[PDB]
Motif scaffolding. Structure first.
Motif, PDB file in Angstrom:
ATOM      1  N   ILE A  84       0.854  -1.204   0.000  1.00  0.00           N
ATOM      2  CA  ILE A  84       0.000   0.000   0.000  1.00  0.00           C
ATOM      3  C   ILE A  84       0.876   1.234   0.000  1.00  0.00           C
ATOM      4  N   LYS A  85       0.508   2.211  -0.813  1.00  0.00           N
ATOM      5  CA  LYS A  85       1.314   3.409  -1.011  1.00  0.00           C
ATOM      6  C   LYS A  85       0.852   4.654  -0.259  1.00  0.00           C
ATOM      7  N   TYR A  86      -0.371   4.625   0.286  1.00  0.00           N
ATOM      8  CA  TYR A  86      -1.019   5.807   0.850  1.00  0.00           C
ATOM      9  C   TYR A  86      -1.634   5.431   2.181  1.00  0.00           C
ATOM     10  N   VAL A  87      -1.360   6.238   3.190  1.00  0.00           N
ATOM     11  CA  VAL A  87      -1.826   6.010   4.552  1.00  0.00           C
ATOM     12  C   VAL A  87      -2.515   7.270   5.050  1.00  0.00           C
ATOM     13  N   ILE A  88      -3.728   7.105   5.564  1.00  0.00           N
ATOM     14  CA  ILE A  88      -4.458   8.115   6.322  1.00  0.00           C
ATOM     15  C   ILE A  88      -4.369   7.679   7.767  1.00  0.00           C
ATOM     16  N   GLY A  89      -3.555   8.370   8.548  1.00  0.00           N
ATOM     17  CA  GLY A  89      -3.228   7.963   9.903  1.00  0.00           C
ATOM     18  C   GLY A  89      -1.883   8.528  10.328  1.00  0.00           C
ATOM     19  N   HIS A  90      -1.401   8.170  11.509  1.00  0.00           N
ATOM     20  CA  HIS A  90      -2.174   7.425  12.491  1.00  0.00           C
ATOM     21  C   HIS A  90      -2.925   8.500  13.283  1.00  0.00           C
ATOM     22  N   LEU A  91      -3.437   8.173  14.457  1.00  0.00           N
ATOM     23  CA  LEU A  91      -4.313   9.096  15.179  1.00  0.00           C
ATOM     24  C   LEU A  91      -3.626   9.856  16.328  1.00  0.00           C
ATOM     25  N   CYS A  92      -2.697   9.192  16.997  1.00  0.00           N
ATOM     26  CA  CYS A  92      -2.005   9.661  18.196  1.00  0.00           C
ATOM     27  C   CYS A  92      -0.548   9.880  17.883  1.00  0.00           C
ATOM     28  N   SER A  93       0.091  10.783  18.625  1.00  0.00           N
ATOM     29  CA  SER A  93       1.504  11.105  18.391  1.00  0.00           C
ATOM     30  C   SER A  93       2.439   9.941  18.607  1.00  0.00           C
ATOM     31  N   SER A  94       2.245   9.211  19.695  1.00  0.00           N
ATOM     32  CA  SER A  94       3.167   8.164  20.038  1.00  0.00           C
ATOM     33  C   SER A  94       3.140   7.071  18.974  1.00  0.00           C
ATOM     34  N   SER A  95       2.048   6.986  18.213  1.00  0.00           N
ATOM     35  CA  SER A  95       1.961   6.004  17.133  1.00  0.00           C
ATOM     36  C   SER A  95       2.377   6.604  15.778  1.00  0.00           C
ATOM     37  N   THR A  96       1.906   7.805  15.457  1.00  0.00           N
ATOM     38  CA  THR A  96       2.252   8.433  14.186  1.00  0.00           C
ATOM     39  C   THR A  96       3.739   8.684  14.061  1.00  0.00           C
ATOM     40  N   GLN A  97       4.392   9.041  15.164  1.00  0.00           N
ATOM     41  CA  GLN A  97       5.823   9.353  15.051  1.00  0.00           C
ATOM     42  C   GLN A  97       6.658   8.141  14.600  1.00  0.00           C
ATOM     43  N   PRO A  98       6.682   7.023  15.313  1.00  0.00           N
ATOM     44  CA  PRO A  98       7.517   5.911  14.837  1.00  0.00           C
ATOM     45  C   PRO A  98       7.067   5.340  13.509  1.00  0.00           C
ATOM     46  N   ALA A  99       5.776   5.342  13.243  1.00  0.00           N
ATOM     47  CA  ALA A  99       5.300   4.865  11.970  1.00  0.00           C
ATOM     48  C   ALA A  99       5.778   5.738  10.827  1.00  0.00           C
ATOM     49  N   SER A 100       5.778   7.053  11.023  1.00  0.00           N
ATOM     50  CA  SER A 100       6.171   7.968   9.975  1.00  0.00           C
ATOM     51  C   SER A 100       7.638   7.718   9.588  1.00  0.00           C
ATOM     52  N   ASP A 101       8.459   7.242  10.507  1.00  0.00           N
ATOM     53  CA  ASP A 101       9.877   6.980  10.159  1.00  0.00           C
ATOM     54  C   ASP A 101       9.920   5.892   9.103  1.00  0.00           C
ATOM     55  N   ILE A 102       9.083   4.885   9.275  1.00  0.00           N
ATOM     56  CA  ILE A 102       9.029   3.754   8.330  1.00  0.00           C
ATOM     57  C   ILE A 102       8.440   4.220   6.999  1.00  0.00           C
ATOM     58  N   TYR A 103       7.339   4.949   7.031  1.00  0.00           N
ATOM     59  CA  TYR A 103       6.770   5.412   5.787  1.00  0.00           C
ATOM     60  C   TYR A 103       7.717   6.337   5.017  1.00  0.00           C
ATOM     61  N   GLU A 104       8.443   7.207   5.701  1.00  0.00           N
ATOM     62  CA  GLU A 104       9.374   8.085   5.015  1.00  0.00           C
ATOM     63  C   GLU A 104      10.488   7.281   4.333  1.00  0.00           C
ATOM     64  N   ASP A 105      11.023   6.303   5.045  1.00  0.00           N
ATOM     65  CA  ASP A 105      12.100   5.440   4.513  1.00  0.00           C
ATOM     66  C   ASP A 105      11.599   4.671   3.296  1.00  0.00           C
ATOM     67  N   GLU A 106      10.321   4.289   3.288  1.00  0.00           N
ATOM     68  CA  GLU A 106       9.767   3.452   2.219  1.00  0.00           C
ATOM     69  C   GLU A 106       9.039   4.231   1.125  1.00  0.00           C
ATOM     70  N   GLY A 107       9.009   5.547   1.223  1.00  0.00           N
ATOM     71  CA  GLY A 107       8.393   6.391   0.223  1.00  0.00           C
ATOM     72  C   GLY A 107       6.877   6.346   0.183  1.00  0.00           C
TER      73      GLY A 107
END
Lengths: 345, 345
Positions: free
Chosen positions: A70-93
């Motif tokens: 999947i290429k597009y994510v609407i999320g996450h909802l909370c900071s403690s979750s969006t922050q570490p997830a965003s590191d992965i999404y940024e690395d993976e484009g």
């Protein structure tokens, strides 16, 4: 081909009520966009993931999204979750647009695949200046704050806006939080014939100031940010809170253009009042706009397109700065009443 | 001497509504404890700090608390703020009891100065097993889950509890999320004369299962965790959701013993329904219990005392494990109705 969009938030845990708002808004937006033709005939498909607003689960979900293609994510909802997830999404484009509203640093790390549709708390400063200049049109302004980061930040932003528009800011001053005696300040407002005050701070100080101002017959219009809007304000101030102006998020479910969505929600027994319904709906509309306008599937192309061109959404026209925050986004302005209620404008 | 207790949470930003609940509960608890004699005559004094649920501000607040000489913190409210702050409090030997409920890892780092008064989501497993055994008393049980972390975790905990009590768990199985056809499962429940099912998962699957079960006249009692309690459940299932059991947090404002507090809140025009009112009130009561019982001012002595001896609070008797989480804490059990309402027990 079908276009998959991940929707990530809390289906479980203590934030599940806000997560339900998020999933409801995303689901309705997807249905509505498909009923208008999708993306040049291609249907959007929502793929929902529960991260329980839990960091470890957020990371698991992000890795699953990567594995799922999947290429597009609407999320996450909370900071403690969006922050570490965003590191992965940024690395993976992978494009990530968050509807959650906490934590300014999310967008301060130079990530190019990240965006938000929730307006930052600090947006209230320019929004107030705009209302003061367009609608209030005061003659002699004073700006007061309590020397704490929240209030002083906002008062400084209001001051910058008003000064930039050539308004007459007569004085700017800090008071001490916990202050119960505003006699000197109010006497100064009266002597200087101040007709409008912006107060950056919290409700206890605003309430004391309002009580004392009205005790001496001041006609001054007061305004502050959401932190002065509290049901115990009119408790401290009594009738003196009547007419106070306050910035708070707009009630998007009251916008006439949104009534179709309000009806779909109510028909499915879903509460349409929740701000995350609208903020999430808007994130989907933003993604769809970018897909349509560019004809591209590449996340980065979509983010650059939105940064350049904006989108029209259920929370109004949106524009983003280069870091992926909203630019010029407005909270609403409300008139407070003695009974703790508040009405628009 | 006066005993200062910091209370930290959101007075501003998107989490301010929950922060108001927190500050209201702490303020009322402090007033009530003082009216009963304080700590052997010494008054508690709340010192409030706004961290806006923002990590950077949380760290600023923690450092200010250290500088201010305060030894006890009730806070913070959000994970992204409580986590970095707790590192500072642990290093400085400051007691921190959080009423916020997200993020299990907070207490998994070996910190000895940290505690919570919010029960973890996973507590629902033992709580359900307890209700099944004490009240339902079924004869033939099946336990079903959707193979995802949330539901399977909870189903496994229920299974462990029921098996440990010598109950008859006939079978345990996973189904596929997104499943619309439950014909084989329901037929198996009927053939095996299953009178009770615990389902670990979310409302779409529960609703489908319930619809199909009632379509074949099954009399089986179903139960699940909070994730099956949704206003769109009775939408999928219709009348079939009637009688479903679900764990959700207890409505503490309905406990008769709490009506004095409910009245004080309503008198000050504060909503008493919010769970963080009670969870925070309870954190203050826990601190006060430890101060009273030990006669000590040392944070670590207080935490060890609570871990050993517990406290009586507005959310009931509390006990903690060695990591500072609540042990054996119960959500309530509710009976769902066809109209989406739910009643206790």
């Amino acid at each position: 081909d079908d276009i998959k969009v991940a929707v990530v938030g809390a289906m479980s845990g203590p934030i599940a009520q806000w997560g339900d708002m998020e999933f409801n808004g995303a689901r309705q937006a997807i249905k509505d966009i498909n009923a208008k033709g999708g993306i040049k005939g291609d249907k959007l498909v929502g793929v929902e993931y529960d991260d329980a607003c839990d960091p470890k689960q957020a990371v698991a979900v992000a890795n699953k999204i990567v594995n799922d293609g999947i290429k597009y994510v609407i999320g996450h909802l909370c900071s403690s979750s969006t922050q570490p997830a965003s590191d992965i999404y940024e690395d993976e484009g992978i494009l990530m647009i968050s509807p959650g509203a906490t934590n300014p640093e999310l967008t301060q790390r130079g990530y190019q695949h990240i965006m938000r549709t929730a307006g930052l708390d600090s947006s209230q400063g320019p929004t107030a200046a705009k209302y003061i200049l367009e609608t209030v049109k005061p003659q002699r302004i004073a700006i007061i704050h309590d020397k704490q980061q929240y209030g002083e930040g906002l008062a400084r932003s209001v001051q910058d806006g008003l000064k930039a528009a050539n308004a007459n800011v007569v004085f700017f001053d800090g008071i001490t939080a916990g202050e119960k005696d505003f006699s000197a300040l109010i006497a100064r407002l009266k002597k200087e014939n101040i007709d409008f005050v912006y107060y950056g701070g919290y409700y206890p100080e605003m309430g004391q100031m309002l009580r004392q101002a009205r005790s001496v017959g001041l006609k001054t219009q007061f305004m502050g940010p959401e932190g002065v809007g509290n049901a115990s304000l009119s408790n401290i101030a009594g009738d003196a809170a009547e007419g106070m102006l306050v910035t708070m998020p707009k009630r998007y479910d009251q916008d006439p253009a949104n009534q179709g969505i309000v009806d779909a929600l109510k028909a499915d027994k879903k509460d349409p009042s929740g701000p995350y319904v609208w903020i999430t709906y808007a994130a989907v509309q933003s993604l769809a706009t970018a897909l349509e306008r560019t004809g591209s599937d590449e996340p980065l192309a979509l983010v650059k397109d939105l940064k350049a061109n904006g989108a029209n959404t259920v929370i109004g026209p949106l524009n983003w700065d280069e870091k992926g925050d909203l630019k010029g986004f407005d909270f609403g302005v409300f008139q407070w009443h003695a009974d703790g209620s508040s009405t628009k404008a």
